[PDB]
Amino acid sequence: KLKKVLDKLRLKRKDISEAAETVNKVVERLLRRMQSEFKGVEQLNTGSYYEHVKISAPNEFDVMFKLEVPRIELQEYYETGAFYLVPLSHFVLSATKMLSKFRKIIKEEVKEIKDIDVSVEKEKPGSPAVTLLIRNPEEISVDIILALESKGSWPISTKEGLPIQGWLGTKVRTNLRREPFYLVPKNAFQGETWRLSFSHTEKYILNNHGIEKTCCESSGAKCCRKECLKLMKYLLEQLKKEFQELDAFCSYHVKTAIFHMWTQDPQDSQWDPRNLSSCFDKLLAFFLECLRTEKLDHYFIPKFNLFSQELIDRKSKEFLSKKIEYERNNGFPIFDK
Template sequence: MSGRGKKVDEAPGERPGAKAPGSGRRKSLAKAEEQSRGSADVEAPAEAKKKPEQKKKAEEKKNADNKARRGAQPRDTRPPASSEPLCAFNDQPCTAKSAEGKKVPRSPPKKGNSMDDDPARILQDTLEKLKIRKNQKSEATKCVNDIQDAINKHVKASLGWCKRIQVLKTGSHYENVKICECDEFDVMLAVSVERVDIQPFGEDGAFYSVAMKRHQKHPLDRFLNEDKTIRASEMLKEFRDKVKEAAAKLPYVTVDRKKQGCPAVTLQVKKDDLLISLDFVLGLEVHSSSWPPFTVDGFKIDNWLSKKVKTDLKRKPYYLVSKYEGRGTREQNGVIAKDAWRISFSHVEKEILKNHGHSKTCCETRPCCRKQCLKLLKYLVQRLKEKYPKEAAKLCSYHAKTTLLHACANRVEDSEWAADQLSHCFQLLLHDFEEHLRKQQLPNFFVPSHNLLKSAGIDKKSCNLLADYIEYERNNSFPLFR
């Protein structure tokens, strides 16, 4: 019996030595549970400390991920401005930026162009800015008319040769293409002459000497040389003196100093809120059966305004103003430069811009954008002169007007200048202007042999730079207009 082992207590109803079903498993589970409770009791304080820290780190990671998904801007990795050349247009590096250097938009881009980059909208907004208030225009016009009457009256009374002087109002104000402010006016006071001999002074047909033919006594006889040519410089001196005398009686008017080669006597008007520059120009009104030979290949309006209009306009007198280029002492055929006269067709330009349509009803039934395009081009010239004073110093609004006249003669139909096609028409006009600059060739509309760009002294380098600036403007929705 002893070899079978010790007797153990057994549960009632159980066989001796037999284990209750599942007792081993229950013991294992109980032991595991006890160990688990004990382990939890030991580790609970440490876990309690770790959870807030882990939660905080998780929140930070989540916020960082969300920020990245929303498009947080990366650090600017572009090189310093000094490490690479700058673009002439916007002072930014000319080299392309890498993809990593670009800013990521905070929200998806909207479909279509932004209103800020819509050329048509920009041009319309610019035209609104260029409009002149009606009351300002009215006040300025009245002021100028009063001054003109005073000057004209004094000059006629003081100079015998000015008794029959004619007043010709020219320039952008009277052509209705003035922009921004009513601050500039041009008035020509012209002496009528007949039976004169007009000879070119120079090779481009823009300047002339004027000699009296055999005639009866004329008020200008006192200004004649032995060869009967008129001494323009002496006429201009007397004229200037009398304008200064008349201006001295007007308390709000001063006279600018004379500029070499300038035909105008310039008055500065400061009256109330008005600041006006008023040019009085001495001229000759030439009555002749024809315009000078240099004009034969110019004034090409046959297909635009009609041959009849061209014939009618050429029957009118043309004008010569006392102006010369270069040194006034330069001599040609016995005539010195300061006694030369420059041909002017400002009266014809005024008539053309007033009646500018291929059809007589242009702008009555359907408006065109010819004048709007000219205003925009004049404004661009003004902004270029402000932005690039060195290259654009000698550029002027007359270059813009001449470009438009050539464009109208080439694109004659009114439908090609429809008002709702302003953006397209202006782009074409700018392209024309670019081509003239790149070729350094802008012919006078009336005298094709007269190159306005070279005559103004704009060199080839400046022409190319100006063309580049204009190309940049039209390809980038006109930054100078904004």
Template sequence: AEALPAARSRAPAARAPAVPQSVAAVPDGAVAAASRRSPPASDALRLREVLSRLSLPREDVSEASNLVNKAVSHLVQAIRGKDSFFSSIEPHNAGSYYEHVKISEPNEFDIMLVMPVKRLQLTESDDTGAYYYVSFKRSPKEKGWLKFLEEDGKLSAFKMLQALRETIKQEVKNIKDMEVTVARKKAGSPAITLQIKNPPSEISVDIILTLKAQQSWPPSTQGGLKIEQWLGRKKRKDFRFKPLYLVAKQNKREKVLRGNTWRLSFSHVEKQMINNHGNSKTCCESNGLKCCRKGCLKLMKFLLEQLKMKHPKELEKFCSYHVKTAFLHSCITWPNDTDWHLGNLEHAFQQCLEFFVDCLQRSQLTHFFIPQYNLLTLEDKARHHFLSRKISHELNNGFPVFHENY
């Protein structure tokens, strides 16, 4: 992801086919009108057409992922060898590409570089329940940690990122058969961004420094992940026994940005939920019924991407994590596979959007794992209402933005 993973909008938008509109425009506004009508068959046809265009060509994906794997593998070996402190670091794949819900072109990847740690002491840095100061319950056996501790014993994300960035900057020069550079640091971003030349385009890889601890999730997560009716009580228990992940991320609510905060990350659980999303175990398997959950998520992401292109200033604070969160809440609101039958794509998509619009109108989108954390801050209420109006307009008019050429 979370206080939000930075919106990644460098990729050119995927283009949907231009389909002539024959529906009379309905003004912007509440979605009530849309929810009263069943989507016409033409809407369904258009959505399926758009969805088919969003599927990435397999050979393009394979070529891009091979380049990324080669570059990351080289860097991980070099990082382990250069500093014994980083010898246990391991790469984990994250993000939409690995959840198989990537849209646009296969030129953006997220890789977590994971450091296993023991016996962490977490102290909340604010009231969101997402950001923490990290220290050790006991002095770590690996003395390499000491150079990254502040005077008060807090683990400095800034110092660790700086050390990692320097090593990577030196090492990219030694990667053979491809041109790799490190992008300039973005303020507040937890990522070290690699740029891999892949004519005629460029592949961007966000490397995210992550701590992994085999310990209980903090109390702020207790009431989250309400998947009992959707994926089952046992699955929730299994997920909560998974390791705790923290990513290096500045908390912008702090008056003085010291770079020593860490944010909870649940991308490993999100990936499993999205890839194994059925209420029944056979959902979308070769011998089971197919559903439209992933299709809805792709369309929601594409809709936000297209609207952001039209209204970059007004929608700059929104990113795909808002959409993913609304989608996950929709999955527990309608937990049964029958609610997501493949033939009901347009109805399911409409329900997801209506749920999201309701959240925007109330400026309340609860983090899926941390119920006390609202991803929509009240000071941005006007932006929330702007996006809700734009989505309502699209919903009421057969999604004209899907068929405009940019």
């Protein structure tokens, strides 16, 4: 049932191999061509594919080109929590200016590639990414995400975030908060605003997700945490393909929701493979409550509400609410298309 849907969603070794070989060539070449104001940049693979929760096909890859910058002063962009003003001379560090040159370089280098069919997607404003379209006969997008790496204490807006104490614990949390934090040129001084990114932390969580250290290891018990994330991701993807009303929603909304549910139900036994249906259903119920109450706090930045009126209109939330409720109460017909 849901088992058979997961069968459909499961990526194939063949496609994984063919997608990765081509993606690695291109990324490797871009990374080499920086190191240039971006000399010192380092590769950090992030998102679904590297978290092992990519569904349906290996067709979207996320990579951070992160740059150590010496200590910086952050000023919070009117109390939003996530957005800040912060070699680099000819870039207050303007996100747009830095991104533009990064982008310019990438585009130049992509022209030189003659063994891969690969172009650079038209810039979407409010995106920190330089997005590559690779046409291995299969279509593959690669987001190249410029990031500043700061080694200081995380900003105070994150003090109450990452509430993993009863789940992953205080030692894990303390160690995670000793890692650097990332600023990505997502814009909101609109064109000089950077946004916090904790993709590195999210990756660790995805791959170290149990209360027991052996969760999902070879001498441990399998849980259904990732399978639930997959299923919820598929529901949204399927709905989004059908209904343009849902343009405003994205997989990060689902990922954030499940982070909260993983905190609510920390016990591995609450995510038993035998309870896949219960688990998926409680995840749906939780997501509906986020929509109803117009509240889905960033896991790392509690005061940043991803479901505020400002980012998503009430009508969109009500639309998605009715569509989820329908699928839930009719055996998820959309999983069969």
